[PDB]
Design an enzyme around this catalytic site. Structure first.
Site, PDB file in Angstrom:
ATOM      1  CB  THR A   1       6.187   2.536  -6.671  1.00  0.00           C
ATOM      2  OG1 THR A   1       5.592   1.527  -7.505  1.00  0.00           O
ATOM      3  CG2 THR A   1       7.572   1.707  -6.477  1.00  0.00           C
ATOM      4  CB  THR A   2       7.485   2.932  -1.062  1.00  0.00           C
ATOM      5  OG1 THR A   2       6.264   3.624  -1.029  1.00  0.00           O
ATOM      6  CG2 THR A   2       8.532   3.763  -0.417  1.00  0.00           C
TER       7      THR A   2
ATOM      8  CB  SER B   1       3.883   7.711  -5.377  1.00  0.00           C
ATOM      9  OG  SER B   1       3.429   6.347  -5.237  1.00  0.00           O
ATOM     10  N   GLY B   2       6.005   7.128  -2.707  1.00  0.00           N
ATOM     11  CA  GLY B   2       6.078   6.770  -1.453  1.00  0.00           C
ATOM     12  C   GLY B   2       7.485   7.393  -1.041  1.00  0.00           C
TER      13      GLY B   2
ATOM     14  CB  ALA C   1       0.362   4.774  -5.447  1.00  0.00           C
TER      15      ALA C   1
END
EC number: 3.4.25.1
Lengths: 227, 203, 227, 227, 227, 227, 227, 227, 203
Positions: free
Chosen positions: I1-2, I129-130, I168
């Protein structure tokens, strides 16, 4: 002296508060049920007290599930609560066993809830009568249930103000294992017999079910066909 | 286990196979994993059988009750949201399941729901140990412009490919088609066998 | 001797304490609702009572959410508690299902809360009536709810001191499917018919909603145009 | 025979026990609030009465927080409990959201607690009225709250034995947007008009607050300048 | 009849059961408190009834802690229960904060317990008044507290049967900032004035406290000097 | 009107139900206690009646522990329950602190249990008086305790039907610090004075304790020597 | 006025409801117990109705355990509940300590249960008297217990309609330390003396126990030998 | 004055509410039971209503398990609740021990449930009598049970309106060890003799059981053979 | 995810991608992670989908109730404090989420809230995660003087860079702009695609 508290027996062994709850029932609109060949039906008169009402709403005949329906007379708000209780209680049984084998057991759970409210201080009885009609594994069923939690199984029966006339009529005119149309026609006749001084019967509610099928509610034009 | 739900223009198709294992041990060749839960709503199950079967019974009962209370079927998204709330509530003592909910309200829908109540709508979705095999086929062959007939063929192809490569998948393929016109229809198994023969498939 | 405890039926099957709660409702300002073409509106008489009062803060019309509003009559503290209940209860349904599909279920929850306060010793009924109006998935809806937890769906309806005059007027004059502005004009006329004694109608409260939209509250300049 | 229990409605839909609690409120010392330009003030009549009494504590004007104050009339111990409840309830909101955005909601929680004591058997209502005054996100605010849990928002108002006189005086003489000093003068004048003929007003309590500031209590000398 | 239940208001807004509780308080032995230069004292008359009674015991003056004392009048067992409550409540504050900064908050907790027993059915009020006296972070403190949970702070005060005679004597004879010995003298004299026609003071209880010190309880031959 | 419930104060501030409980106590058999040189004793009269009774059990004098004894008068089953409570309460204190330093605290725990049964509806007071006698870290102790939970400490005292005769006798005849034999003699004489005349004394219960020892119950033989 | 509720003392200090419960006991069948040489016995009469009744299910003397038996008189269903309580309470003691050292403690637990039902509103007294008889570490024991929870230990005693006659007979005829056969004979004579005109007495129940042994129930044919 | 609450003894020691509950029982249809050779049977008078009632649906004879049946008289809803209780209570005993050794214990648990409802306020007694019949490890058993929870074991007995006639008839006609067929005949004979004015016994319900078998319910056809 | 939230002079901009994974397995390419929760308030979600989604439903319910009750919108700081109280209460049985709350009251705000209810205001923030890739781009290229057109490009750039390096993260970029004049407005996909095309990007 003996009719003020639900927990008080009269010297003759009567519970007058339960008897007075019955009087609320007698003031409701007439409803009837009857068994016919492989089926059961319900018809309900509707007190109409204004053209401003959406009449196809807050209906007298209520589906409990797809195979069981109820009609009530007496205090409306109380009736709603009992129909909600019957519905939740039908689904609990279904979840537990996977199906509802005998409609009598659902009816007894509703009737036990009502009985409870005649035995404890600080509560009033429900001012309601119900007819349940449907199909279970035994076949087509027709029950009634009063404010005391008294139940009976019937071939034909009625509740509400016209009860006495409708039951009279049916007791003379009723035949077992009629076909649907004829059962419906008999029921309208019975209902009409209770009306008084040239009073017109507006289109009642009618619902029927036969073995291997789900309930159907007659729409407006199908009912007028019988009027 | 292998399950799949796909949407087409005016249809949902849902399919599973039927194998029930304990490790390598094939205990049942014909378990059921695809259920009608409402007039235009189907559900597939994967994961722990007891947990999933309890959810199926609940959903049947609650959607029938909701319909009676509301005079309309629960919207498909509302079904997914109900499950989402129920499963997230018991997050730390979970239902150990993966569910697909498919149906028609004003549009066709497929939702995928996880054991923590995460719910995401998709054009198509697969669950169970066989699902990566199904995603291969779907990625390669799915089209939104497919007919119901081609959609039925695709899911049979996809589950057949998964049965070839996933030892925890096997048995007869059950397929249901959901449309506004005909409602929820489980296809006759003789019709599935005929499609299998014609597509050139085995087991 | 039968009218002192909510749990006591009279010999004729009546709950006089519930009946007395509905007398409290008759003393509130008049409010009405009516369905119109793809819409529903509410109107409420503002009984003004001093220039020392903040006018903007007194609201008889209350948003339950963006698609559902209510107006009340009777005991004001009671009403406020019922509105709070209805607001929490709407949000609970929206959390559970993601939306509120049918307004009738919300109204029934409110009506059940009230019904319960007519059945148990040690509690009094809410001395309140409500009109709920909004758009759900069925369409525009209009309901009333009384101290017994009795509900009816309406095409048009009223509550408060001028209920009977307003209902009378609307039975004579209301028709289905009016454009918004004719429905408002008709409602103002219905409201004026209840004033009596050459009494002047001061600027009421008005709210409406049409399918695909959110509620709007008429500002006071807009209401004047109908006066 | 309908006035002995809070859970008993009269045949006209009245709750006499709640009306009797109001009677207690009318016996207290007169207090008033008014909005003025960018602020609000409270003045309280101090019926001091004995030299052996400390003229410093158990004041009529109580701070709820730095931005909200109240003054009460009626049963004193009841009033203290409601003030304690209000202070705790203000802090609960501030901890939850970081601030208290709209003072009306605080007044509603206090009023809901009062309302609950008019609905359940086994409790009596609070014999108290409050005026709340302060500044929130909306601006200067002024509320009253009675034993029934009824609230109203005001530009000016009063409670206690001289309520009726004070309100008459203000309905004639009150003007919006007075600078602080003229508002106080008007309030003092308003309060003098309430006293029984030829009876001298000793130093009242006075508190005020303006947008962007915290409350201030006027010291014993600053009040005198107005006497 | 409006005077049989604590939760019943009279038409005038009175709680008669609470007023009757304060009659019980009028039958106790006279006690008084007064502030003097940098201190406060308490004096209590004891109704001695027989030489068979152990007199060192069941004191009228009870320490709540080292800096705070009380004296009670009315129902003796009720008063003992309230003194226990005060003691434990004092200790809870001290544990929570390290000290008791303001004695008024202790008195308010006691008074709040008493206010509770005038609001809920199934209890009666405590038939007790107390005087609290001690030193806190504010200085010397003197409060009383009645069955309703009403509190006032004083310079001098009295409770019990001689209250009215003691208070009128102090009203004309009391002066602020007396040296301790002169305060006691006046106190003794105030007490003597409440006694009927050629009666004699039988050595009261005396206790005092000054700033920076703990309480001292005068012994028999110390009190003897003042008689 | 005012004497039917313990929670109801009369207009004069009395609790008639508690006073009626005191009437039960007056019907019991006379018992007395007195302090002597370094000890304390109890004497209990018993009108023992029928020869079919076992005289050697259901004693009037009950050991609470080895250092404390009680004697009761009034409702016998109530008394038993209060004695059971006192024994368990004594042991609770011993477990907590390792000993019972001051018997007064045990007596207050019993008296607080009695007080509570005069303040909460749904319950009647205990129809019992007790004398407690024993030795603790302060010395020999003697207390009485009545249905209201009122306690006093004594040099000598009595309960039961002959209370007043016994007490008036001891008022003139009692001396402090008698040896044990002379204290018992005086006690025996005090009890005889309360008798009906021509009526004789048929061997009381007698128990005593002196500092450093545990209680001794006088055997049937040693009591006779005093008659 | 004073005899309707268990929690209400009369002005003379009486508990009338408890006295009325003792009237229920006077209506039961007559039973007696008596101690003899190394033992104790119980004898119960009872009117058998029809010949359609099953004797043997005849239920007067009830074993509590192997060493302890009871007979009751008064309301039979109340008596069954108290007998079940006694049995379960004896087993709890036996499990806790391994045995029942003193039967008096068992009787006290039962009597304490009956006492509580004379002190709390919402409950009526047990309308029952019991005799307990058995052997413990002290020796043979005989106790009675009445609706108030009052207990006495006896050499001989009786309960039920013929109590007074039986007690009088034993008053004149009872002797301690009789052999078992003489005891049973005397018991039978005492029972016969309580019958009217011409009755002769059908076969009663008889049970006895001697030191070192367990209870024996004389069977029909053994009892006949005494008639 | 003494017949309005189940928790109030009359001065003669009566519980009139319990007596009034019996009166409801007397209005019920006659049922009887009798022991025959290795067996026991029950017969129930049905009592009619219209041809519209489903015959064979709300049976008066109810199986408790395969070995135990009950029949009831009095309030029908109360009766259903007691039968549901008896069914669950039997299964609980079977789960606990593996079987139901002695039916008297089941009857006692049912009778104790009914007894509770005569002792606690806020509750009314069950207006029901029951006969239980079955076979246990002791042999064929027959018990009755009334609203008080009073139980008796019998060779033959009856309940309902025709009880005294039926019992009178059995008291002369009943023979110990009859064969099933002759027991049934005597039963019908006895039942007929309770009908007044040449009234016609339509088909009653019959059930029997003999050692080593389960219960049999006679078909409508099999009963006719006896009519 | 970002996910990302930035403040400008009189604007808040919030954006996310749409990838939903179970480890390496891309289950859903078009999950939703940015929501309007009040008139001038948006929220992004990251972490366990079921926890996040329940929290989105609660905030929509509660912010609506509050506004009905107060007749004003909950201040953005009050939203963040509410969340912070709720998450902290259950910190030993936590919502396993990172949340961004952004909006306009009298000023623009972005708040970042962790799984233990720690809440901090910042000029910009990113979660998932981004987020480290995003902070790279913003550190280099953020200016407080940017216009709304520029900030929109900037977050498209940040997220595009994250999608290149974080497996991700993936799928279409969602963007909302929040102002006093227009409130919360979701940008049409065709406009984001056009900007991705104009800026010279992919995925």
């Amino acid at each position: 002296a003996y009719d003020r508290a639900i927990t008080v027996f009269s010297p003759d062994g009567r519970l007058f508060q339960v008897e007075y709850a019955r009087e609320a029932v007698k003031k409701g609109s007439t409803a009837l049920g009857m068994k016919f060949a492989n089926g059961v039906l319900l018809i309900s008169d509707k007190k109409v007290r204004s053209r401003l009402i959406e009449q196809n709403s807050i209906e007298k005949i209520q589906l409990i599930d797809d195979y069981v329906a109820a009609v009530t007379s007496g205090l409306v708000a109380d009736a709603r609560v009992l129909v909600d209780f019957a519905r939740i209680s039908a689904q609990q049984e279904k979840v537990t066993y996977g199906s509802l084998v005998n409609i009598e057991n659902l009816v007894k759970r509703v009737a036990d809830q009502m009985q409870q409210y005649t035995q404890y201080g600080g509560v009033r009885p429900y001012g309601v009568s119900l007819i349940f009609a449907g199909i279970d594994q035994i076949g087509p069923r027709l029950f009634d249930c009063d404010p005391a939690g008294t139940i009976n199984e019937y071939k034909a029966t009625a509740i509400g103000s016209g009860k006495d006339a409708v039951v009279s009529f049916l007791e003379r005119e009723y035949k077992e294992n009629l076909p649907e149309k004829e059962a419906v026609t008999l029921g309208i006749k019975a209902l009409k017999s209770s009306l008084e001084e040239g009073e017109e019967l507006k289109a009642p509610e009618i619902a029927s079910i036969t073995v291997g099928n789900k309930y159907r509610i007659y729409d407006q034009e199908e009912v007028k066909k019988f009027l | 286990t292998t399950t799949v739900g796909i949407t087409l223009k005016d249809a949902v198709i849902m399919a599973t196979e039927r194998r029930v294992t304990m490790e390598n041990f094939i205990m049942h060749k014909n378990g059921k994993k695809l259920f009608q839960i409402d007039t235009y709503t189907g559900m597939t199950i994967a994961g722990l059988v007891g947990d999933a079967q309890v959810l199926v019974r609940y959903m049947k009962a609650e959607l029938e009750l909701y319909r009676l209370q509301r005079r309309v079927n629960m919207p498909i998204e509302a079904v997914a949201t109900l499950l989402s709330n129920m499963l997230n509530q018991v997050k730390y003592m979970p239902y150990m399941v993966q569910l697909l909910v498919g149906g028609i309200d004003t549009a066709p829908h497929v939702f995928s729901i996880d054991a923590a109540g995460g719910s995401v709508e998709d054009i198509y979705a697969s669950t169970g140990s066989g699902s990566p095999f199904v995603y291969g086929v779907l990625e390669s062959q799915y089209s939104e412009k497919m007919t119901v007939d081609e959609g039925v063929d695709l899911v049979i192809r996809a589950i057949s490919a998964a049965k070839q490569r996933d030892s925890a998948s096997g048995g007869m393929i059950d397929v249901a088609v959901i449309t506004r016109k005909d409602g929820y229809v489980q296809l006759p198994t003789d019709q599935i066998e005929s499609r299998i023969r014609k597509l050139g498939l085995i087991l």
